[PDB]
Amino acid sequence: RLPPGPAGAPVVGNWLQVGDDLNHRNLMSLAKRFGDIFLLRMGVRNLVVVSTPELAKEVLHTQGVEFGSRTRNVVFDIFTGKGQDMVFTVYGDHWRKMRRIMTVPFFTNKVVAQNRVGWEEEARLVVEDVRKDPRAAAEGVVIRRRLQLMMYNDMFRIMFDTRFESEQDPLFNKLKALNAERSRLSQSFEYNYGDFIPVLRPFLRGYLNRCHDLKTRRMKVFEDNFVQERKKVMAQTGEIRCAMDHILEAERKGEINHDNVLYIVENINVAAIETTLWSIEWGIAELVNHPAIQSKLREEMDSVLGAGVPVTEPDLERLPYLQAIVKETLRLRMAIPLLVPHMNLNDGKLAGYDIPAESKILVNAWFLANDPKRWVRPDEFRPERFLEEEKTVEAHGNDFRFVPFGVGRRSCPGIILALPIIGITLGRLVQNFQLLPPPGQDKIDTTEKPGQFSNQIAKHATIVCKPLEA
Numbered sequence: 001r002l003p004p005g006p007a008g009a010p011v012v013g014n015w016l017q018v019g020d021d022l023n024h025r026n027l028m029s030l031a032k033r034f035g036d037i038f039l040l041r042m043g044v045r046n047l048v049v050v051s052t053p054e055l056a057k058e059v060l061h062t063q064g065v066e067f068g069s070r071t072r073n074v075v076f077d078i079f080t081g082k083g084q085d086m087v088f089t090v091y092g093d094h095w096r097k098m099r100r101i102m103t104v105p106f107f108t109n110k111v112v113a114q115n116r117v118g119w120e121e122e123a124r125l126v127v128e129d130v131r132k133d134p135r136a137a138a139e140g141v142v143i144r145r146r147l148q149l150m151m152y153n154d155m156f157r158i159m160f161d162t163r164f165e166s167e168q169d170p171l172f173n174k175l176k177a178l179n180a181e182r183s184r185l186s187q188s189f190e191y192n193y194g195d196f197i198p199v200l201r202p203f204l205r206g207y208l209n210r211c212h213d214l215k216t217r218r219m220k221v222f223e224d225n226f227v228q229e230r231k232k233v234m235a236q237t238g239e240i241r242c243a244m245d246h247i248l249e250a251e252r253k254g255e256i257n258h259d260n261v262l263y264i265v266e267n268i269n270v271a272a273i274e275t276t277l278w279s280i281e282w283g284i285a286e287l288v289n290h291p292a293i294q295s296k297l298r299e300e301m302d303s304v305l306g307a308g309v310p311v312t313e314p315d316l317e318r319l320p321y322l323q324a325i326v327k328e329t330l331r332l333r334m335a336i337p338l339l340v341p342h343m344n345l346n347d348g349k350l351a352g353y354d355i356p357a358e359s360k361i362l363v364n365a366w367f368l369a370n371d372p373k374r375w376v377r378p379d380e381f382r383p384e385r386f387l388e389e390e391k392t393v394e395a396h397g398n399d400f401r402f403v404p405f406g407v408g409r410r411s412c413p414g415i416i417l418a419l420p421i422i423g424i425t426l427g428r429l430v431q432n433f434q435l436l437p438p439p440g441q442d443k444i445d446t447t448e449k450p451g452q453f454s455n456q457i458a459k460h461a462t463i464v465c466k467p468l469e470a
């Protein structure tokens with residue numbers, strides 16, 4: 001009836017057997033013991049993990065409604081207003097409304113066309129700042145730091161038609177720290193006792209007070225420094241000139257309330273910025289460690305675009321090797337490796353097993369994308385696979401082995417923004433630098449740090465960026 005799994009113990013369930021760190025690696029090991037679908041009890045919380053494309057199809061597509069909700073806990077409830085946001089809402093009319101209101105301002109080809117030259121410039125500014133850093137060509141630079149500013153500027157250009165001038169900008173650093181604390185508080189293991197053993201919830205008072213205050217400070221910065229300016233600019237310009245203008249217009253029309261507006265901002269800041277950065281950083285690391293692939297990419301852009309001609313968004317469709325490098329980075333180095341948790345509001349069935357209502361459903365998407373029984377040597381960083389035996393497999397999940405952006409109703413709408421940003425950024429870097437390891441090393445250390453939320457390079461990479469002219 002229930003899926004197989006390790007026998008639990010009273011009130012702790014499997015918590016003390018498996019620990020707090022549930023990631024795509026040790027969930028693979030459990031799948032090796034218990035099969036394509038297995039159950040864990042984290043105290044009172046049911047967790048179901050599926051590890052086949054067939055089961056991903058069931059969770060994401062065939063029963064996409066039945067399993068189309070999100071799990072929450074007392075911490076995420078504070079930050080999302082108990083699902084008054086977009087990401088962490090259950091499936092229903094609220095989610096439909098939010099998803100619809102966000103489509104025109106954020107997630108169309110027109111949004112891409114209106115923002116691509118900003119993305120292209122922010123990428124060029126990364127190159128210029130690294131190009132002038134004396135360390136970059138010598139011991140190397142931790143390039144994700146400058147790329148972080150690029151991601152902030154790309155996303156705040158879309159949201160508010162604004163950017164941050166430098167890594168030293170006070171507002172940029174204030175916002176960065178609030179976003180970091182927002183995610184640290186929601187991803188910390190230290191509140192698990194009160195979620196898994198709910199009778200202990202009173203002892204979380206202090207932790208939850210900390211979450212309240214963080215939300216207060218973070219929403220205040222969103223409001224004071226970005227949202228209120230748009231109301232002012234909207235009134236004086238009389239028009240709708242950025243994504244969040246559309247959102248505020250929906251509030252003015254009475255379709256949403258101001259809390260919904262701020263939760264959209266809250267969502268984009270945790271869903272879009274560091275997430276894209278992880279893939280860019282991973283791709284840089286693998287390009288350093290695969291010089292032949294790096295040179296082949298550089299040759300593609302020179303051949304297709306011409307020498308010295310910068311890559312732009314409309315060029316990506318005629319740079320299939322660049323696109324394949326991006327897909328292979330999302331495959332081998334999938335940085336959101338368990339997607340986002342799904343949840344069934346009502347009792348359901350998967351693979352014939354009964355799934356209790358409100359179970360947390362995890363798709364091990366990294367494993368789907370790296371299963372040696374379903375891919376040709378997935379351990380290799382081989383972008384050519386997406387030009388050869390995988391040449392029809394795309395990032396939007398037409399093949400249920402490769403679902404880095406999900407599939408179906410709860411799939412990532414930001415795919416339309418992430419893919420061009422990654423491609424432009426990697427292309428621009430390779431057009432201007434030889435990407436090399438630091439002098440004392442032959443390779444970038446690509447050891448994973450797998451967690452329930454992200455699969456980041458464990459050590460932020462120090463990259464030597466040697467100008468091609470040097």
Ligand code: HEM
Binds near residue numbers: 086336411
């Ligand atoms: C490489 C970068 C990114 C990756 C790999 C990624 C991946 C994902 C995944 C796996 C999900 C959940 C799929 C599921 O629940 O089955 C998701 C959801 C979401 N993503 Fe992204 N994403 C990226 C960038 C972005 C960006 C740039 C934005 C917005 C500008 C964004 C906005 C969202 C939103 C709003 C959701 C929630 C969708 C819903 O629950 O209805 N993402 N993303």
